[PDB]
């Protein structure tokens, strides 16, 4: 009795150990993705375009008459442009005049890779569209494909229902 | 069979409690009759008439204990449960009535 | 996928019992999941059970104790509770919320399935036609189990229904003369009960094929009504996408019913009996009917929704509504347990609604159905004789009655009594049946045709 | 004051719509059963219905006549009058190859018309039995069973055309029992088919019961079927 | 033409901007276009009952207003098919989506438009002919068993302008063209009828013909009729589904509509697997059963709102075939699940409940449902006769026949097939109580029985008296111990057992009890009653003599007769036909008569 | 003459079940009538249940299906549903709203009467006395019926209450030492019963004096709320203006009570017992009490309403409130029916309040009152003896108890059992009574004075 229960415990712990190692591999990839995104942010000619999208995207999700755009101070010159080019479009896509201001007193933490967050007038409704939030928001949904892409498909799965 | 099949009511609850008390008294009185017959029977041990009287009395006592009262108790417990179920649906309706009144009052303000 | 950023709200309108009501919500979605953070950093989740205009009613799983009105921060995921599922969940232990509690990692999903599931198209559902050998004569003989069948054990507090379920997990095979993946949902139970099963699964050497979901007595009562869905959702992945035969055991379903009743009272829903929601049946069907084989795929799900009967009341809504949905029940009682009979399975109030097709020529032995039906007649009559003899006395009985008392006495100790580790075959069970039937003369075995008696009875 | 008349059981508009149809139906049945208008007695018996048909009336004009009471607008009385004709129609059509004499048709009309409840009468049962036999043979392979049933069916049709269905003539009564038995008889059980058929043929008083009933071509197939069966 | 969703509480959705919407119009809720039906109107806001799961529906989703009410498509292609609760064919969904799950928002035609039907006109119509509602202007050969009559829909009439010649036509073509007042109408083979409206008939007639059931009890003692209504309020395990399936398999009806409303999913699969393997000879040819049946699946784990549509869809189909001159015997295996749906919706609606939480209008829904049954004279010039019978199960909680659904049902149905859980526990199937059951059609069928049998009626009476006397004695025997019983009473008690064990119960999953032809039921009953009379006479003529024939004397002398009488069930009518069974029963009668002559 | 044009509104506020709510209505009149024109041209009617300001709640009789909230036109009649009545309404069949169903014309308004009823001054009410000889021994002997009485027949589902009511109708008459007009209100009656009564009236040649109001089980359930008021309104015209004697039959007050419950729930009123409106008592009193005689008239109304008792009880609010209003009952039982006894009437829980005065010297027989009481007591005792026998056995009874048991068996066989096509007179019924009483020695007949016994008992 003792021999087989001990081997059961050993095999169960070995299974958990390799599973933990697999999760470390997934984490290393995601932490590399963060570093790759930072390198992209450093490129003004692509980051300004990213910001153009990020600001307008948040505006469509809130659909409020008054907006407050919060960013880290370092990126303020580009967020300012992102808003300026976003409003003419917003007033066309929604046919609603929106007063969009940038918060010059509150800023995002300096350790945020990039992006903006937008608050409504009373700061009770906010959309978080920074790079860390986007990476997890997508990565958590694409994970089934990463699992296969890195470790292979499960040979025992025949149907996709 | 399993129940006397009297529709759940407060009247039925009262009747069953009176019926149960009667059955319990009959059980005890017949048990005392049996005990008195058993003592006389053992003292003598007009003999076979006592053996038949004891078996007949004990059979009736056993039926009260194993058939008639269990059936009264099951009926009484059934009635009690059904009465609480009726109480609940009255509570439910009254709660919704109180909430609807509150809603109507707010609309008027 | 959902590419748009999710919104976060600090617009809680008010809190009433377990329900947190938000206002100013953009295009609320019904049955979407909301994540909320309390002022002290505690994270909790809930589901939108109602939307109206800009308002939404969120039922919080962990509870509403400590929920604020001004500092509470909520975000809407934008979808329903779809949960990660993977084949390698077998050998893992999860809580009732779907999170690991075995110090392993989170699930590395192969897909995300809707916890609510979908009904299986009755045109593609294939009727079960295979028998599982439980090794328990009280079951394999008189109430056979089919693969894909739904058979709860009706029990009562203090009875060894946990031992029977554990026994079934180890010695459940086939009569085709096989390793089942077991999903065990431990909800509303104490530590010792959950540890009992976990230890037994390791003792059996099968833990690598067992997935556990735990929600203990000291865990939130709202999570107790998704745990079954989490277990079954995993079972559906394994059975219908990976063609693995799965055995799903749900511990005292009465803790599910009580958790549901609490929610019904909180939302002021229309009661049925004993305060339970008038839709209790529909909700149970959503859980129970996630079972059976599907044509064209080699998997199956078999369920054993064991439940405790409050006060041994067989008509209590829990066993009543279950009895209407499942293919019968095994049913244990106290009259057998109080005499140290194991397993304490009472065949008389039990039935298996698929037995008629899983036994007989080509399945077990051609006399199977005939032996079972006559044993039922003899057992019930013996009980009827005791009911009479308790009043009239042994002297009032004739030889026709004593035979049933002899049968009843030998039946319970030879046929039902086995022991936790007694594994009998279905063929041995029938042979025992005949040994008891041979107590009576041929003329009294009135449920069995002479075309069967003439072959089997003489032996 | 006419919010919901529900005349008998139909909305007033639906009731009168049924009356208009029934009038047209009788007109169609009369033209189908008596293309030459020979049944003078019966056509007069429906004169109050046929006056509204066989004429250039529009559907709406007949519907108006019903609402205004200018035609037999009693649907229940009109229905009975229709049925005692529909049953006569199927009686004649179900025996198509053998026409009744005009005198027999009028006799059958009166016998059915005078019945307290034609639908449940023996007349209806006999017609249902005949149609079960004649409908099956509308589309059937020339199998031993089907050739034997065909031969007996033509005799049944002949005898009905001569006698009708009012008298319990032993000829038609035996043929009904034998025909329904053979039709029910399993298609593969040929030995009983030949046994039953031969028993019939040598029970009838005629030396050749089919002489003049069925054509020579069917007689050639009928006899060849028996010849092959008895060959080995 | 659209509204917008305002809120969702589950199966009930509230929508706004629907000022012109009427009650009981269909709507399409959500971007998946979920099927629902308007229940309430509050200003320009509508309350919508949705027949599909509402999870994922958002506030602001469009709602399409459809002028047509909930309706059923009626035409060829129904028989042999299985439908969901709103008439979407499951074999067509599974053949198109390749899935095993039923998707939400599936828009599939009720009847396939690809099949080329064989159509023959009536040959009695001409251009200029006057045609009215219910008239048949052609036939489609769906299969060899059921001839599908193509009727002019009710509320339509006019002159015929064109009739399609015989040939091959599908359900999208035009078969009949008719005109009324300038307006012309083009009809195909498929008509649409609101499912909540009763199809009109010429006359509702009394039911005077048995509905044959493949059971000894549920026929000999408690007959059902063609067009009648019965209830089976059995507790779980009582075997009421088996009684329903037995009636479906082996009956004298022409069309069976089986409605699984809240039923276990495995039960509908059991029908689809087993039925194709059953036989029913037509005219010497063996044919499958499915060609004369149709079934609706709305299983317990499907949307609860759909349970109402399922019940009405089923009966609407039944009426359709009734109108064509067929005898229909539909059976809904639940009823309580429908009333349960009404309770759940009423709750979400915040309506004031009545008895035990059920809507006050529960009785109204059941009354109007069951009254659509009956033998009728059909509308239509061809003078058809049809019927719809309804055999509906009920599921009282705990087996207590006190709930609003069982109580209301018993006030509606004319045949009561009560089941006793305590008989099912003993596997005494069918578990019919036979003490609380009744049939109000006994007098109606007395004419039938005298015409064809005669002997049956006095046998039915004697059997009931024996069973009642046994109950009257059992009540006191339990207390006395069989000490004070007269010899005439011991015979009654033992013959009553003989009847109970060998006559009233039968194993429906055997080659010999799966179907019990009526002649066999009355045959074996005659012998059992004949024994009763001879055994009772034997003691009555000897009790006062110098030797009384007590039970123990006849029991030992005639033990072979008592065993033979018990074996009478094991006759296998398919292997041993009528001739052998009647001869065998006659032999037992002779054996009894000879033994009595040697005894007395 | 109300020569004022009617207003028609499209200002529909909403529709909720059987109720249609209108707004912007000018001076709404309570209990007014509104004609509804549906978008498709369908015409329906309804009656106002309440008014408040510019809003009114309309009760729609034919049903609300198909009504929208935009186009439906609502015409206010300006008056209360006063119904056309005529003496020539006999020989006609109307539907539940008083419209022709027999292919005849709309009743010509000889006059109009407010169906709500005009209260009759109790000072002018004439006490009923003359006995109606119904032919049924259970009624003519014990619970006799006076002309102008109010004696409903209670029954449960499945019992032959339709046969008893039909038998009374065709056998009705006075005790002799010319006949009744029938007003028959069918409320929720199935087609099989509807033709049962219609055919029985025709076969006996009664239709010349019968007016039927048929609201069938498949007809609208709101309409039947007025149906009984339309029937009695005609009865009141015929009895009090046309000097006819009218027997009024109400096929089920239970389907009527359910119709009231549906409406009461629809307007979210506070219920009483079992969900019925707290005012059920009044709604019944205003129908039941439309009976009796009045000074100056020769006609009369006799009511014999029928009530199905849910769950076979007699404490259900419907029969409970009826019992408080009507003057006794018949109460058709089930235990007698199961024993093939017809009419299966149980004499113990059934009384007739006017019986004590409608019998005796000058009306029936000197001893009528004494025979009734003695038979009643004998039956009651016999039932108590039967209750004991079931426990102690037939061997534990004394000689007197056996006399009551013999009485009980012969009483039901010879007295109560009659047959549906045989009528017996009050004098024949009493003679049978005496045959049953003569089972006992005179000393045991303690409820009959010695003078009565000496006159009749020895005969
Ligand atoms: N008439 C019958 N003949 C034989 N076995 C039966 C019969 N009725 C029920 N049974 C058995 O009992 C079981 C219970 O019947 P079922 O219809 O499932 O119960 P329910 O009343 O819950 O619908 C069946 O599956 C079958 O094994």
Automatic annotation (TrEMBL), chain B:
<dbReference type="InterPro" id="IPR002699">
    <property type="entry name" value="V_ATPase_D"/>
</dbReference>
<protein>
    <recommendedName>
        <fullName>V-type proton ATPase subunit D</fullName>
    </recommendedName>
</protein>
<comment type="function">
    <text>Subunit of the V1 complex of vacuolar(H+)-ATPase (V-ATPase), a multisubunit enzyme composed of a peripheral complex (V1) that hydrolyzes ATP and a membrane integral complex (V0) that translocates protons. V-ATPase is responsible for acidifying and maintaining the pH of intracellular compartments and in some cell types, is targeted to the plasma membrane, where it is responsible for acidifying the extracellular environment. May play a role in cilium biogenesis through regulation of the transport and the localization of proteins to the cilium.</text>
</comment>
<comment type="subunit">
    <text>V-ATPase is a heteromultimeric enzyme made up of two complexes: the ATP-hydrolytic V1 complex and the proton translocation V0 complex. The V1 complex consists of three catalytic AB heterodimers that form a heterohexamer, three peripheral stalks each consisting of EG heterodimers, one central rotor including subunits D and F, and the regulatory subunits C and H. The proton translocation complex V0 consists of the proton transport subunit a, a ring of proteolipid subunits c9c'', rotary subunit d, subunits e and f, and the accessory subunits ATP6AP1/Ac45 and ATP6AP2/PRR. Interacts with SNX10.</text>
</comment>
<dbReference type="Pfam" id="PF01813">
    <property type="entry name" value="ATP-synt_D"/>
</dbReference>
<comment type="similarity">
    <text>Belongs to the V-ATPase D subunit family.</text>
</comment>
From TrEMBL, chain D:
<protein>
    <submittedName>
        <fullName>Uncharacterized protein</fullName>
    </submittedName>
</protein>
<feature type="modified residue" description="N6,N6-dimethyllysine">
    <location>
        <position position="126"/>
    </location>
</feature>
<feature type="modified residue" description="N6,N6-dimethyllysine">
    <location>
        <position position="177"/>
    </location>
</feature>
<feature type="modified residue" description="N6,N6-dimethyllysine">
    <location>
        <position position="22"/>
    </location>
</feature>
<feature type="modified residue" description="N6,N6-dimethyllysine">
    <location>
        <position position="198"/>
    </location>
</feature>
TrEMBL record, chain E:
<dbReference type="Pfam" id="PF16886">
    <property type="entry name" value="ATP-synt_ab_Xtn"/>
</dbReference>
<feature type="binding site">
    <location>
        <position position="240"/>
    </location>
    <ligand>
        <name>ADP</name>
    </ligand>
</feature>
<dbReference type="GO" id="GO:0046034">
    <property type="term" value="P:ATP metabolic process"/>
</dbReference>
<feature type="domain" description="ATPsynthase alpha/beta subunit barrel-sandwich">
    <location>
        <begin position="108"/>
        <end position="196"/>
    </location>
</feature>
<dbReference type="GO" id="GO:0016887">
    <property type="term" value="F:ATP hydrolysis activity"/>
</dbReference>
<keyword id="KW-0813">Transport</keyword>
<feature type="binding site">
    <location>
        <position position="429"/>
    </location>
    <ligand>
        <name>ADP</name>
    </ligand>
</feature>
<feature type="binding site">
    <location>
        <position position="239"/>
    </location>
    <ligand>
        <name>ADP</name>
    </ligand>
</feature>
<feature type="binding site">
    <location>
        <position position="241"/>
    </location>
    <ligand>
        <name>Mg(2+) 2</name>
    </ligand>
</feature>
<dbReference type="GO" id="GO:0005524">
    <property type="term" value="F:ATP binding"/>
</dbReference>
<feature type="binding site">
    <location>
        <position position="238"/>
    </location>
    <ligand>
        <name>ADP</name>
    </ligand>
</feature>
<comment type="function">
    <text>Catalytic subunit of the V1 complex of vacuolar(H+)-ATPase (V-ATPase), a multisubunit enzyme composed of a peripheral complex (V1) that hydrolyzes ATP and a membrane integral complex (V0) that translocates protons. V-ATPase is responsible for acidifying and maintaining the pH of intracellular compartments and in some cell types, is targeted to the plasma membrane, where it is responsible for acidifying the extracellular environment.</text>
</comment>
<dbReference type="InterPro" id="IPR000194">
    <property type="entry name" value="ATPase_F1/V1/A1_a/bsu_nucl-bd"/>
</dbReference>
<dbReference type="InterPro" id="IPR024034">
    <property type="entry name" value="ATPase_F1/V1_b/a_C"/>
</dbReference>
<feature type="binding site">
    <location>
        <position position="237"/>
    </location>
    <ligand>
        <name>ADP</name>
    </ligand>
</feature>
């Amino acid at each position: 009795q003792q021999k087989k229960i001990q081997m059961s415990n050993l095999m169960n712990q070995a299974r958990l150990k390799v599973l933990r190692a697999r999760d470390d591999l997934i984490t290393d990839l995601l932490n590399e993705a963060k570093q790759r995104l930072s390198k992209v942010v450093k490129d003004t000619t692509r980051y300004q375009v990213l910001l153009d999208g990020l600001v307008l995207q948040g505006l469509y999700q809130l659909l409020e008459p008054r907006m407050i755009v919060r960013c880290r101070k370092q990126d303020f010159p580009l967020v300012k442009a992102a808003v300026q080019k976003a409003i003419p479009m917003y007033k066309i896509a929604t046919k609603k005049d929106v007063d969009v201001q940038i918060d010059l007193e509150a800023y995002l933490p300096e350790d945020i890779a990039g992006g903006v967050e937008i608050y409504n007038g009373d700061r009770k409704i906010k959309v978080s569209n920074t790079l860390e939030s986007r990476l997890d928001l997508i990565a958590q949904q694409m994970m089934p494909e990463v699992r296969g892409a890195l470790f292979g498909a499960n040979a025992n799965r025949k149907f996709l229902d | 069979k399993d129940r006397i099949e009297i529709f759940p009511s407060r009247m039925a609850q009262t009747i069953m409690k009176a019926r149960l008390k009667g059955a319990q008294t009959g059980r005890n009185l017949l048990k005392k009759k049996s005990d008195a017959l058993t003592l006389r029977f053992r003292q003598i041990l007009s003999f076979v008439t006592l053996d038949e009287a004891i078996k007949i009395t004990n059979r009736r006592v056993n039926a009260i204990e194993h058939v008639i009262i269990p059936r009264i108790e099951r009926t009484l417990a059934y009635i009690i449960t059904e009465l609480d179920e009726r109480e609940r649906e009255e509570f439910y309706r009254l709660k919704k009535i109180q909430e609807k009144k509150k809603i109507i009052k707010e609309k008027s303000e | 996928y959902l590419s748009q950023p999710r919104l976060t709200y600090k617009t809680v309108s008010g809190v009433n019992g377990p329900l947190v009501i938000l206002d100013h919500v953009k295009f609320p979605r019904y049955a979407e999941i909301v994540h909320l953070t309390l002022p002290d950093g505690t994270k909790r989740s809930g589901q939108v059970l109602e939307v109206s205009g800009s308002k939404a009613v969120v039922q919080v799983f962990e509870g509403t104790s400590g929920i604020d009105a001004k500092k509470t921060s909520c975000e809407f995921t934008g979808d329903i509770l779809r949960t990660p599922v993977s084949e390698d969940m077998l050998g893992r232990v999860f809580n009732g919320s779907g999170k690991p509690i075995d110090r392993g990692p989170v699930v590395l999903a192969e897909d995300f399935l809707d916890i609510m599931g979908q009904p299986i198209n009755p045109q593609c559902r294939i009727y079960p036609e295979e028998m599982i050998q439980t090794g328990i004569s009280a079951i394999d003989g008189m109430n056979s189990i089919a693969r894909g069948q739904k058979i709860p054990i009706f029990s009562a507090a203090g009875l060894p229904h946990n031992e029977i379920a554990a026994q079934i997990c180890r010695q459940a095979g086939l009569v085709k003369k096989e390793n089942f993946a077991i999903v065990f949902a431990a909800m509303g139970v104490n530590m010792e009960t959950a540890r009992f099963f976990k230890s037994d699964f390791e003792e059996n050497g099968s833990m690598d094929n067992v997935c556990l979901f735990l929600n203990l007595a000291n865990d939130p009562t709202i999570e107790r009504i998704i745990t079954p869905r989490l277990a079954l959702t995993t079972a559906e992945f394994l059975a219908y996408q990976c063609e693995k035969h799965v055995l799903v055991i749900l511990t005292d379903m009465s803790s599910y019913a009580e958790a549901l009743r609490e929610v019904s009272a909180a939302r002021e829903e229309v009661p049925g009996r004993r305060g339970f929601p008038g839709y209790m049946y529909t909700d149970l069907a959503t859980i129970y009917e996630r079972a059976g084989r599907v044509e064209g795929r080699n998997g199956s799900i078999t369920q054993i929704p064991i439940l405790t009967m409050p006060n041994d009341d067989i008509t209590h809504p829990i066993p009543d509504l279950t009895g209407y949905i499942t293919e019968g029940q095994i049913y244990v009682d106290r009259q057998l347990h109080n005499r140290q009979i194991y397993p304490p399975i009472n065949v008389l109030p039990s039935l298996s609604r698929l037995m008629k097709s899983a036994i007989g020529e080509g399945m077990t032995r051609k006399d199977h159905a005939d032996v079972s039906n006559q044993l039922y007649a003899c057992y019930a009559i013996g009980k009827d004789v005791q009911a009479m003899k308790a009043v009239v006395g042994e002297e009032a009985l004739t030889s026709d009655d004593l035979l049933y008392l002899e049968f009843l006495q030998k039946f319970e100790k030879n046929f039902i009594t086995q022991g936790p580790y007694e594994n009998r075959t279905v063929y041995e069970t029938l042979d025992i049946g005949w040994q008891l039937l041979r107590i009576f003369p041929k003329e009294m075995l009135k449920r069995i045709p002479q075309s069967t008696l003439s072959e089997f009875y003489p032996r | 004051i006419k919010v919901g008349i529900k005349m008998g059981g139909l909305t007033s508009e639906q009731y009168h719509s049924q009356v208009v149809g029934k009038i047209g139906y009788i007109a169609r049945c009369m033209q189908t059963i008596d293309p030459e208008n020979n049944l003078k007695k019966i056509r007069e018996d429906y004169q109050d219905v046929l006056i509204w048909a066989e004429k250039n009336y529009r559907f709406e004009e007949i519907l108006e006549a019903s609402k205004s009471g200018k035609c037999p607008n009693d649907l229940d009385a009109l229905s009975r009058r229709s049925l005692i004709l529909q049953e006569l129609l199927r009686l004649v059509s179900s025996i198509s190859p053998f026409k009744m004499k005009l005198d027999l048709i009028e006799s059958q009309y009166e016998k059915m018309k005078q019945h307290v409840n034609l639908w449940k009468s023996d007349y209806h049962v006999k017609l249902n039995q005949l149609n079960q036999l004649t409908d099956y043979l509308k589309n059937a392979a020339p199998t031993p069973k089907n050739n034997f049933l065909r031969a007996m069916t033509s005799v049944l049709q002949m005898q009905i055309a001569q006698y009708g269905i009012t008298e319990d003539n032993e000829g038609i009564n035996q043929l009904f029992k034998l025909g329904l038995h053979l039709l029910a008889m399993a298609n593969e059980k040929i030995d009983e088919q030949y046994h039953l058929f031969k028993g019939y043929v040598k029970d009838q008083p005629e030396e050749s019961p089919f002489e003049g009933i069925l054509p020579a071509e069917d007689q050639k197939i009928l006899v060849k079927t028996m010849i092959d069966y008895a060959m080995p | 033409t659209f509204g917008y969703v305002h809120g969702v509480s589950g199966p009930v959705v509230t929508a706004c901007d629907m000022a012109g919407a009427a009650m009981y119009e269909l709507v399409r809720v959500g971007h998946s276009e979920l099927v629902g039906e308007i229940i309430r109107l509050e200003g320009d806001m509508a309350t919508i009952q949705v027949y599909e799961e509402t999870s994922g529906v958002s506030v602001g989703d469009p709602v399409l207003r459809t002028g047509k009410p909930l309706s059923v498509e009626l035409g060829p292609g129904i028989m042999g098919a299985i439908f969901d609760g709103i008439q979407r064919p499951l074999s067509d969904i599974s053949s198109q989506t390749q899935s095993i799950y039923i998707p939400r928002g599936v828009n599939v035609s009720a009847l396939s438009r690809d099949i080329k039907w064989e159509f023959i006109p009536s040959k009695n119509l001409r251009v200029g002919s006057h045609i009215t509602g219910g008239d048949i202007y052609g036939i489609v050969n769906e299969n060899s068993l059921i001839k599908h009559k193509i009727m002019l829909p009710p509320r339509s009439r006019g002159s015929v302008t064109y009739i399609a010649p015989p040939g091959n036509y599908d359900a999208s073509d035009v078969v009949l063209e008719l005109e009324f007042e300038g307006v012309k109408e083009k009809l195909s083979m498929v008509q649409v009828w609101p499912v909540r409206q009763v199809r009109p008939v010429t006359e509702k007639l009394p039911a005077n013909h048995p509905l044959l059931t493949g059971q000894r009890v549920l026929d000999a003692l408690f007959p059902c009729v063609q067009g009648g209504t019965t209830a089976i309020p059995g507790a779980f395990g009582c075997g009421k589904t088996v009684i329903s399936q037995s009636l479906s398999k082996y009956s004298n009806s022409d069309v069976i509509i089986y409605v699984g409303c809240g039923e276990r999913g495995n039960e509908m699969s059991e029908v689809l697997r087993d039925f194709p393997e059953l036989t029913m000879e037509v005219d010497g040819k063996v044919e499958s059963i499915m060609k004369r049946t149709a079934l609706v699946a709305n299983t317990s784990n499907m949307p609860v709102a759909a349970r109402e549509a399922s019940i009405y869809t089923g009966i609407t189909l039944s009426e359709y075939f009734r109108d064509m001159g067929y005898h229909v015997s539909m059976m809904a295996d639940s009823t309580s699940r429908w009333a349960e749906a009404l309770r759940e919706i009423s709750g979400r609606l915040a309506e004031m409940p009545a008895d035990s939480g059920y809507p006050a209008y529960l009785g109204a829904r059941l009354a109007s449902f069951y009254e659509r049954a009956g033998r009728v004279k059909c509308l239509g010039n061809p003078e058809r006769e049809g019927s719809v019978s309804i055999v509906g199960a009920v599921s009282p909680p705990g087996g207590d026949f006190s709930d609003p659904v069982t109580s209301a049902t018993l006030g509606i149905v004319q045949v009561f097939w009560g089941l006793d859980k305590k008989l099912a526990q003993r596997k005494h199937f069918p578990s019919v109580n036979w003490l609380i059951s009744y049939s109000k059609y006994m007098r109606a069928l007395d004419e039938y029985y005298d015409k064809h049998f005669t002997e049956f009626v006095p046998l039915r009476t004697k059997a009931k008296e024996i069973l009642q006397e046994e109950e009257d004695l059992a009540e006191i025997v339990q207390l006395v111990g069989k000490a004070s019983l007269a010899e005439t009473d011991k015979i009654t008690l033992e013959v009553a057992k003989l009847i109970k064990d060998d006559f009233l119960q039968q194993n429906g999953y055997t080659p010999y009890d799966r179907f019990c032809p009526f002649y066999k039921t009355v045959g074996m009953l005659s012998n059992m009653i004949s024994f009763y009379d001879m055994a009772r006479r034997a003691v009555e003529t000897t009790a006062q003599s110098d030797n009384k024939i007590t039970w123990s004397i006849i029991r030992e002398h005639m033990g072979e007769i008592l065993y033979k009488l018990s074996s009478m069930k094991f006759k296998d009518p398919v292997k041993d036909g009528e001739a052998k069974i009647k001869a065998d029963y006659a032999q037992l009668l002779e054996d009894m008569q000879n033994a009595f002559r040697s005894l007395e």
